[PDB]
Design a protein around this nucleic acid. Structure first.
Lengths: 132, 419, 132, 132, 132, 124
RNA sequence: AUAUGGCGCCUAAUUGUGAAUAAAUUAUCACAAUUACUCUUACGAGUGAGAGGGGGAUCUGCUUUGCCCUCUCUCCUCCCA
């Protein structure tokens, strides 16, 4: 899991924008690696945090956490510094047993991606229409 | 041109530090002779020699010019300066007294002065592998080593805010005008059912009727200043590791091929690195021309306890509102100390320093006896600014956002006070 | 509430120094007044705080307190900021029974004044000598 | 001390096996580098961890821990993937002073290595024979 | 696990010195055998202790403990008896289950050996360099 | 009065040694320039401070002060020091000032003051 | 059971002098000093670490040192009744 520049292509409603995320320092207090946009200011605006808690007397049950956070901002007519008027964000949480297999984890990843790609979730998020 | 080399102007004509020159200066070569002459005094082989010939042949060192900085923060932290001095060859004066009595009529005794020698300088070395590890553990124990003080500071500042809120309530009662309702706070200190005695007055029941409040305010704001001091001292992490490296100097002949001088030179090279932290927005453009001092911090606290104050009989309102406003000003000023705190500066330094040495004369049967003292002239010193930190940092913004929130709230509260 | 200007005289051993004390305010907590010299400097301004108490619960006798500060104001101190080097404390405390008299109070008052004016207390306060 | 594929050569009783530990990563929450045998199932990989603790205010001593983890497969004749049945541990704990020397501490290392090679420890570990 | 003279060769940075430890008396209070420098006084300076804890209520789960101590001492310029200025020490603790087998025990020990011999640990505590 | 490196040659009991004094920062708290040995450590050991106090409510009467300080160590075990104070009136002339400088130098080089400084013997 | 969780035991100490047994040690007690490294081991100096206090310390400073100034105290600790 080397940290470096991540180029997220074919994204958006029409799948034409691209996102470039550089890494930053990893949170020592809880071991969380972070990327943010290439910058400059949007680096401290958009964030992508990833952590993997390994087993313990509390963990059994590896837990992989993936948070994404996009602040929508703008500039008042007369102001200079943009203010954040909104905050979108999402959290993905995988829980795997110690006997889990890379096999299993991989198809899980791919199934989640394909579901996100499927029309169902497409309209369920894009339009917030429940399945009916 | 107007400002010194390492300075530049801003948007509104304000003094600012010229990063392009601070971090990427113009090196230049220099060959300024310091002691290009040596003097021998005494007698050698029955010949008194007191000439004065040169010793320096050719010099070449790269270095940076002279620069100036200005603090880029309220606490007064200055930015680091890129400096270079990498002489092609070292330099060490030797004020020795060579002498040796040999048989068959061969005696020598004299004193040397201003005699130097050039030797190799080991510039190629890097202790990054040994220095980088010594940050992670320090950061991890940091919160376990100062979380106590940080927490007590967080509670102290909230307690200050609470005190100011109660004071604001009292003042608003004063402004609206009431003698009995004004005692809402008076009942919060006596710990007792205080009864009246006669008809009091607004300013009379507020000028010193709140002595416990004033004492508490003074004490805990001095408390916060003291902890503040340490806390900002805590935003810097410098660590270095030193090792020894013995070197040999080529042969040299102070006289005309009359005796050889050899031995050894003990030096140590230490690699040091220092990481700092401060705001990530206003660090580049920090207004140094408009800020309040640190003494008024004590001034305001002692003002209400000062039993010498005539403005209570001319314009209580103005003086008290100015008290509020200046407190809020100082609070906002110190607020920037905790907004978006990240890596802002970083320097890496490599320096060589002598410790000891040895001398050994050898021309015929080890006849020379040396009892000298060594001193260096030129030492390798290279300090470079770097921004690439190839390791997990301690981003201290999340742990300070609370303090920033608190100060902003308290400033809003105090600026909300009107005449 | 004391708001009176006191024009003192016969200050110092020579007796040729004079002083003036102008009120500066009242401390509506402990029945204390305040008086100072004309000026704008702590060291150059001499302090006089009188205080009068009445019985409430902790005590059954009056208290007349008087605290005078005569700081030594130095001229040459590296700039035009006369600071203080020797703080002159003078603390006087009285305690009168609630059944005492103005006659008795005046008696102690005048006896204190006369002893201060006589060469008795001058030797012990200035030259610092014991009772031989 | 960069992490890297560690290939431990002749190993075991007759000295013929070999071990290949891939660098996993380094938990910074406690500053510990992790190595693991190449596989898929975390529960059945040979694991190793190294940490170096600097001298602190309550320690004031150099510490270095090396931990070794060897689970056993005990795969059942079908019916599901293998299950962990036994686990061998090794825990090595070097500790030195601020003023100690690379000399000293290399020497004591190679001491420990030679000791683990020597016939005494051979039967004191392998055969479980009490030292006597 | 016979006790007798142990000759560890190829020791130190360069692996050229040699150490000869003679055996001593087995501590009966806890059953611990010990070896020490050939002597004379270093016999009471440098120590290597071997312990084999058998199962019990508290144990399960055999243990094997190996503790090495090397005290660096020096002679003040004027004194006679050398005083210990520093002390190095290491402890290895093997824990084996009651069904553990010799093959796996030996596997573990020689793996410790090669790890100690590997670049990783040698850098990690000759220089105190966590892998980074 | 430019501040630069000063090479004092022919000094000592027999006028052989030399002192290299490089300048430092002029003390802004009292406006006094400083020079110190070539270094490194002797820079903070040896000191030569120069000031020219112009007239004031207490001065009138320019006062040019030159202080020299030599600490001898082996920790500083001894400290020698000297101070010269020239008081010149406003109508004084540079003729007068150079006369005074040169006279004082010729005195310090004259036998009497070498006798009274080096061996510390009163003129008797 | 690794990380770490639990159990127990333990704490200022070192050196020297008194008593110590008939005689020698001599723990317990008392008595006297020590405490971090380098420097002569003389006095004392330097540095690292921490603790506390005072100053209020930004404008055009140096820097072969990386950075608020200074005073005081400690080198098994800190806190309460």
């Amino acid at each position: 899991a080397k940290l470096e520049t991540v180029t997220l292509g074919n994204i958006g409603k029409d799948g034409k924008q691209t996102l470039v995320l550089n890494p930053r320092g990893v949170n020592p207090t809880n071991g969380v690696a972070s990327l943010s946009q290439a910058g400059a200011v949007p680096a401290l605006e958009k964030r992508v945090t990833v952590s993997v808690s390994q087993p313990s007397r509390n963990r059994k049950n590896y837990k992989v956490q993936v948070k994404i956070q996009n602040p929508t901002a703008c500039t008042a007519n007369g102001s200079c510094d943009p203010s954040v008027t909104r905050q979108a964000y999402a959290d993905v949480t995988f829980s795997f047993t110690q006997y889990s297999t890379d096999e299993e984890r991989a198809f899980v990843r791919t199934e989640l991606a394909a579901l996100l790609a499927s029309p169902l979730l497409i309209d369920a998020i894009d339009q917030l229409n429940p399945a009916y | 041109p107007k400002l010194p080399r390492g300075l530049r102007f801003g948007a509104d004509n304000e003094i600012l530090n010229d990063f392009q020159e601070l971090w990427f200066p113009d090196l230049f070569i220099e060959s300024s002779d310091t002691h290009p002459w040596y003097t021998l005094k005494g007698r050698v082989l029955n010949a008194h020699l007191d000439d004065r010939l040169p010793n320096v042949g050719g010099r070449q060192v790269r270095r940076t010019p002279h620069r100036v900085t200005v603090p880029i923060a309220s606490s007064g932290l200055r930015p680091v300066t890129t400096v270079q001095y990498d002489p092609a060859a070292l330099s060490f004066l030797l004020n020795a007294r060579v002498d040796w009595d040999f048989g068959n009529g061969d005696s020598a005794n004299l004193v040397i002065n201003d005699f130097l020698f050039r030797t190799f300088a080991p510039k190629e070395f890097d202790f990054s592998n040994s220095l980088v590890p010594r940050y992670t553990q320090a950061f991890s124990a940091f919160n376990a080593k100062y979380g106590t003080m940080i927490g007590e500071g967080l509670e102290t500042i909230k307690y200050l805010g609470l005190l100011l809120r109660r004071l604001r309530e009292g003042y608003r009662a004063v402004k609206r005008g009431d003698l009995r309702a004004l005692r809402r706070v008076i009942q919060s200190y006596h710990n007792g059912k205080w009864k009246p005695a006669t008809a009091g007055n607004l300013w009379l029941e507020f000028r010193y009727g709140l002595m416990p409040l004033f004492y508490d305010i003074r004490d805990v704001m001095l408390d916060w200043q003291n902890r503040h001091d340490k806390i900002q001292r805590l935003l810097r992490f410098s660590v270095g590791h030193g090792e020894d490296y013995v070197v040999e100097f080529d042969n040299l002949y102070p006289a005309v091929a009359y005796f050889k001088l050899k031995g050894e030179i003990t030096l140590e090279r230490r690699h040091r690195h220092g990481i700092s932290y401060a705001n990530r927005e206003g660090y580049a453009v920090f207004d140094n021309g408009s800020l309040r001092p640190v003494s008024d911090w004590k001034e305001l606290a002692t003002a209400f306890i000062n039993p010498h104050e005539v403005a209570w009989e001319l314009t209580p309102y103005s003086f008290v509102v100015d008290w509020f406003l200046n407190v809020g000003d100082i609070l906002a000023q110190q607020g920037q100390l905790y907004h978006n705190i990240d890596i802002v500066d970083g320097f890496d330094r490599r320096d060589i320093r002598l410790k000891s040495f040895t001398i050994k004369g050898e021309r015929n049967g080890r006849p020379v006896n040396v009892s000298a003292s060594l001193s260096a002239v030129d030492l390798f010193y290279s300090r470079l600014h770097t921004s690439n930190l190839p390791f997990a940092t301690l981003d201290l913004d999340t742990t300070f956002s609370s303090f920033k929130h608190v100060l902003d709230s308290i400033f809003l509260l105090t600026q909300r006070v009107k005449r």
